[PDB]
Design a binder for this molecule. Structure first.
Ligand SMILES: *[C@@H]1O[C@H](CO[C@@H]2O[C@@H](C)[C@@H](O)[C@@H](O)[C@@H]2O)[C@@H](O[C@@H]2O[C@H](CO)[C@@H](O)[C@H](O)[C@H]2NC(C)=O)[C@H](O)[C@H]1NC(C)=O
Ligand SMILES: *[C@@H]1O[C@H](CO[C@@H]2O[C@@H](C)[C@@H](O)[C@@H](O)[C@@H]2O)[C@@H](O[C@@H]2O[C@H](CO)[C@@H](O)[C@H](O)[C@H]2NC(C)=O)[C@H](O)[C@H]1NC(C)=O
Ligand SMILES: *[C@@H]1O[C@H](CO)[C@@H](O)[C@H](O)[C@H]1NC(C)=O
Ligand SMILES: CN1C=CC=C/C1=C\NO
Ligand SMILES: CN1C=CC=C/C1=C\NO
Ligand SMILES: CN1C=CC=C/C1=C\NO
Lengths: 538, 533
């Protein structure tokens, strides 16, 4: 009749899950568990209300809907873009989370990994193939949780001060999910006293924001930030600029029939079909740019009491372990989304004039003086016009400014103020990668190795990549268990030393064994982190 | 009586002296007066041409050194005393010197004219290290050098006033160049082939004659060693010149420009000298109180402006620098530095040093300097900080201004040759940490190592001879390369794109690219934008 392993009771009522086959054995999956009331109609732009209790059994047996979001059409049918696109129907009814646990359920409480996806806060879903929790769970016997959270206007449109669209509700979705894990994860055999958040890009920035918001901070114990940071220039917005964008979006969809009463304005926004808001979303940004997203977390004194920069500098982080890193070519992926001269389908050997124009696109909303400073640092003045070098340098500009230097700065401050920090650079280019060779190791392409996706028999990774995947999964789960990625009791394997503000040590992750190196682009990030902000104040 | 040592010039008759060199004799005429003594009412005024004399001027010894400050940082030390005056001080100092082959040439011989450096506050044509005898004998040029007024005497300016118009030290130099045009043929020199060369403020001076049309017809080619007229230390604006002149007056008890200059003229020369260092705005190495002023007369615009606008087709220029331009200057005010230890400074000392070595810029400007010159993998390592501050000082004051001059001239039609001088003299008395310091290529250019009473190596004498040949080749033809010499490695012209220069040392010529191009991009391209906005 019924399999007891696939049956679990949580505070809201009863759940039925599914038994998944994995290469190494079975896993129990509870997919599409409701954790909030659907943020529908009157509840659009509002904080999540906890899911009301239910009688009977909810089938948590497949991923639920993707939150409404823009769908990338740059390269239709192309694997490199389609792998990030929604693989379920779009709906505002999307606040569901997923739990993977070993089969049979653990007898003693087990460390929990909680995944937060990225996607510039305008996109993403926990149902993407590349976030499939089944391989980590089988290989490392952790519990894995992932949640959907609202993105775009639905998650981060903000009219600061107003009760009808307070902003940051996407982050509140994540927090509600974290609360859910505390109350309920023990029913799946997981340890609420050992929870590790990990995320990539906007998900890493989310992880960092939970670090800096005290009501989140009690809900977990460690953090992993992959290729993103909360202090990233794309990751937050000021109250006034948020209002400006909300208001311009309202305006572009006929609300009201500009500004006025906030209650009236939001009520008119609530009568618009979801798809209509999505179609106008990209038209509210101040300047045309790769790498900037219309609706993002707002610094408003509530969720974030100050800018993440301030909060990072002022924080005491004793008792905290953090794992951070970047891929080898953070910037390259973004250039084909607007930098003049770039395409995945040619070598993108740009001119000097194209480089200068690309700097403005890749570093939006800085003064001319600031742009000149960037051109100075990044030009090789013995080869000022070599196209290949210019292509590489623009990739460096975009990557450094948006990912590498925000991460480096976070890493150095956390270390200096009490946290044990570990840092990596991911340097392996997947044999299956469909982006062109000039992009090197692009943003996002470590994720599939962390999740053990190469162990999927239907895919065509090499045996060495499968070994590599297993190494990474081991590092991540070691860190989740102990706060230290190093093998507890393995000596003759090279050690991953902590990252500190002085020595700035990190390891390279690739097919070769760990190599220790110094400095997360230290010379470059001194420009972005130490000097440029002094210039913007003058 | 030796007829070779008798010469008549426009003003009258002269008697010279025969000098010895290891390669044979040379004729020297030393202490030739080219101006009326700029004394009394003539202090601060433009030079007047020397009135004609009767009888024979004795031109057998160096004349007096123009009044200047005497360096007392290391009393008796060779490294400093070799630049100090070696004749008594006097305002009656406007004399020049001519060295010629013996017997005097009987066909037009190319002329080299030497303008000394010393920050526009010091220097003399009589210093041992500027001895013309070896170049003249070895390369068969005529060599001329002049004294010109320095310090307040040469560059005190109350702009708009006719009592202290400024730049008269530059006019001293021009008047000597005019003297060369009118009189050098009498020595066998060719007035249609005159090459100016100079080092530091002398190099800045050469550049300034390039950029001033009344000087430009007085010579044909130019050599700028470790200096440039666009140096941040080489000129001053009218407003700031007036302020400095005014603060000198106050410091020496003087109170209307006419009244002010009149009072200054009543003061003993030594009194002006004693106060000159104390008129500068802030504590600094590498800044000098009285320098050329940009007032629309001698210089119709800034040398930067003039350089960018100029048409320089038909000009050949030789420019260059020593391997370590900054190091010598650091012992004159950079905290932590001494010639008598390793000068392994702390980062606090480094940061303090940056404000001294790059004076009168905003905190933002200094921060940017500190950014570009810090190794952020090793922000506090003493040796690297010592080296980096040497780079800051040398790049800012010498290398990048020379690089900018070279680039602009080449791109606007000049043929430019560039070098880096990388040989450390076996006899050098400054510490090893200073490398090849400012000034220490000069002795090789003048062939001082051929002097048998000095202790240079055999290889160093051969190197001196190479350099004298390059310099003389350039003077004769606008090209330092050995005219027809196939298998010897060639010195290519410097261009804005390829930026090629050669290294000068005991090794054969080696071609390299870029005069600290990454660093000078900062000083020449970014930093001006910053200060403007
Ligand atoms: C490299 O590609 C870019 C992108 O253009 C597209 O992709 C190419 C592979 C090719 O299929 C083109 O037909 C596509 O238009 C090129 O940049 C574009 O150039 C066209 C015409 O010159 C211009 O109208 C577009 O605005 C340009 N787009 C951008 C973003 O600048 C680029 O010229 C290609 N370089 C080559 C072929 O050397
Ligand atoms: C290197 O020397 C400098 C210069 O100091 C002078 O010269 C020395 C050789 C020695 O004789 C010192 O006593 C002289 O004062 C040192 O910098 C000085 O440090 C003292 C304090 O120790 C300070 O009062 C002076 O102002 C400093 N001078 C300057 C120019 O800043 C420096 O400490 C020496 N380096 C060492 C010892 O490692
Ligand atoms: C906006 O309109 C509502 C509805 O009538 C009313 O509460 C008030 O006029 C406005 N609300 C606020 C908070 O100003
Ligand atoms: C498009 N996208 C969305 C989320 C994370 C990564 C990503 C792209 N990497 O190339
Ligand atoms: C020796 N010295 C160095 C820089 C500026 C002025 C100076 C001397 N005049 O007193
Ligand atoms: C002190 N001085 C004066 C003129 C030229 C060079 C010089 C010093 N270099 O060490």
């Amino acid at each position: 009749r019924e399999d007891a392993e696939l049956l679990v009771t949580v505070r809201g009522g009863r759940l039925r899950g599914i038994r998944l086959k994995t290469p190494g054995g079975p896993v129990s999956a509870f997919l599409g568990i409701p954790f909030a009331e659907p943020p529908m109609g009157p509840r659009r732009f509002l904080p999540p209300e906890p899911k009301q209790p239910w009688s009977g059994v909810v089938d948590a047996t497949t991923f639920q809907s993707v939150c409404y979001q823009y769908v990338d059409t740059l390269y239709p049918g192309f694997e490199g873009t389609e792998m990030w696109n929604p693989n379920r129907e779009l709906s505002e009814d999307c606040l569901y989370l997923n739990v993977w646990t070993p089969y049979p359920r653990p007898t003693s409480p087990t460390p929990v990994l909680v995944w937060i996806y990225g996607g510039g806060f305008y996109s993403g879903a926990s149902s993407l193939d590349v976030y499939d929790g089944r391989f980590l769970v089988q290989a490392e016997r952790t519990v894995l949780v992932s949640m959907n959270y609202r993105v775009g206007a639905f998650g981060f449109l903000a009219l600061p001060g107003s009760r009808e669209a307070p902003g940051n509700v996407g982050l509140l979705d994540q927090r509600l999910a974290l609360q859910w894990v505390q109350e309920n994860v023990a029913a799946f055999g997981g340890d609420p006293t050992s929870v590790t958040l990990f995320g990539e890009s906007a998900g890493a920035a989310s992880v960092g924001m939970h670090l800096l918001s005290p009501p989140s901070r009690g809900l977990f114990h460690r953090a992993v930030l992959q290729s993103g940071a909360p202090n990233g220039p794309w990751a937050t917005v000021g109250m006034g600029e948020a209002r400006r964008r909300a208001t311009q979006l309202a305006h572009l969809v006929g609300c009201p029939p500009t500004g006025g009463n906030d209650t009236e304005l939001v009520a008119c926004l609530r009568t618009r079909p979801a798809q209509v808001l999505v179609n106008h979303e990209w038209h509210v940004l101040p300047q045309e740019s790769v790498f900037r997203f219309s609706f993002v977390p707002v610094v408003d004194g509530d969720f974030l009491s100050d800018t993440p920069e301030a909060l990072i500098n002022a924080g005491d982080f004793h008792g905290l372990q953090v794992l951070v890193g970047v891929v080898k070519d953070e910037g390259s992926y973004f250039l084909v989304y607007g930098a003049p001269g770039f395409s995945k389908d040619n070598e993108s050997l740009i001119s000097r004039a194209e480089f200068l124009a690309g700097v403005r696109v890749g570093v939006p909303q800085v003064s001319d003086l600031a742009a000149e400073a960037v051109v100075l640092h990044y030009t090789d003045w013995l080869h000022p016009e070599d196209p290949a070098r210019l292509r590489e340098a623009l990739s460096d500009v975009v990557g450094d400014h948006n990912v590498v230097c925000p991460v480096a700065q976070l890493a150095g401050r956390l270390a200096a103020q009490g946290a044990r920090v570990y840092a990596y650079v991911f340097e392996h280019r997947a044999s299956t990668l469909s982006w062109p060779l000039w992009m090197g190791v692009p943003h996002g392409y470590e994720i599939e190795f962390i999740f053990g996706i190469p162990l999927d028999p239907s895919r065509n990774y090499t045996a060495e990549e499968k070994i590599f995947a297993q190494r990474l999964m081991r590092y991540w789960a070691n860190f989740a268990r102990t706060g230290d990625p190093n093998e507890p009791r393995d000596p003759k394997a090279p050690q991953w030393p902590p990252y500190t503000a002085g020595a700035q040590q990190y390891v390279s992750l690739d097919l070769r064994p760990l190599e220790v190196r110094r400095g997360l682009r230290a010379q470059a990030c001194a420009f972005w982190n130490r000097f440029l902000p002094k210039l913007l104040s003058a």
